[PDB]
């Protein structure tokens, strides 16, 4: 799955 | 909440091979990846590269393809950068981060005989 | 390989003041561009993802615009925790790519 940035501590 | 903990300092002599660890808590190490960053003293941040623990996928900014190599000790959640022969041209701060929102505290390499 | 231009390299400003920072880049970049605060002896600390994303806990103060290849964090109010460096990263290729960093210092 394509890293987002933030997407671990706010999500995608 | 998340860590991501690094050794504040390594020392290494010029050409002896040196593997800066990342280790994680607070969170499932397999569902997010793994970045490594470089920066030097005075200047910016440069990425190494990512490794993602559920597969072992990687990518490798090229500029490092010969100097860093990434692996992961999935069982301890840890994550690991390998520097091979290292010059003062990697005497650097390195941190780890997951997405560029948790980040590691930094390990200060110095490469010094 | 896309280069990001932050410039100038420092500005000063007085507590109080409002501020905008540049970052312009080699290449379109859509909305791929994040902002991030970095302190002295500290690890960077993400302030706006996806150029205008908020992000949680980081005071209204700070929000970002741009357009593609011209991008740029707003400060109303800089505060006394804000002075430090910024540095502005795209992700819309890899190598992810940061710019160079602007400091900004306390004018007294």
């Known amino acids: 799955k394509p890293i987002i940035i933030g997407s671990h501590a706010y999500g995608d | 909440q998340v860590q991501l903990q690094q050794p504040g300092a390594e020392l290494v002599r010029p050409g002896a091979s040196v593997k800066l660890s990342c280790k994680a808590s607070?969170?499932?190490?397999?569902?997010?990846?793994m970045n490594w960053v470089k920066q030097r003293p005075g200047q910016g941040l440069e990425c190494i590269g990512m490794?993602?623990?559920?597969?072992?996928?990687?990518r490798l900014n090229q500029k490092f393809k010969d100097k860093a190599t990434l692996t992961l000790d999935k069982s301890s959640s840890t994550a690991y950068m390998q520097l091979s022969s290292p010059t003062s041209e990697d005497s650097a701060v390195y941190y780890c981060?997951?997405?560029?929102?948790?980040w590691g505290q930094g390990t200060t390499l110095t490469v010094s005989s | 390989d896309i280069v990001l231009i932050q410039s100038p390299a420092t500005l000063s400003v007085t507590p109080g003041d409002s501020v905008s920072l540049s970052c312009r880049a080699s290449?379109?970049?859509?909305?791929?561009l994040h902002w991030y605060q970095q302190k002295s002896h500290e690890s960077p600390r993400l302030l706006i993802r996806?150029?205008?994303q908020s992000i949680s806990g980081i005071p209204s103060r700070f929000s970002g615009s741009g357009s593609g290849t011209d991008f740029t964090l707003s400060i109303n109010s800089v505060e006394t925790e804000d002075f430090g460096m910024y540095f502005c990263?795209?992700?819309?290729?890899?190598?992810?790519?940061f710019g160079s960093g602007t400091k900004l210092e306390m004018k007294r």
């Open positions: 981060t997951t997405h560029f929102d948790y």
């Open positions: 607070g969170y499932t190490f397999t569902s997010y990846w």
């Open positions: 490794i993602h623990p559920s597969d072992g996928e990687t």
């Open positions: 290449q379109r970049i859509s909305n791929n």
């Open positions: 996806y150029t205008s």
């Open positions: 990263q795209q992700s819309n290729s890899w190598p992810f790519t």
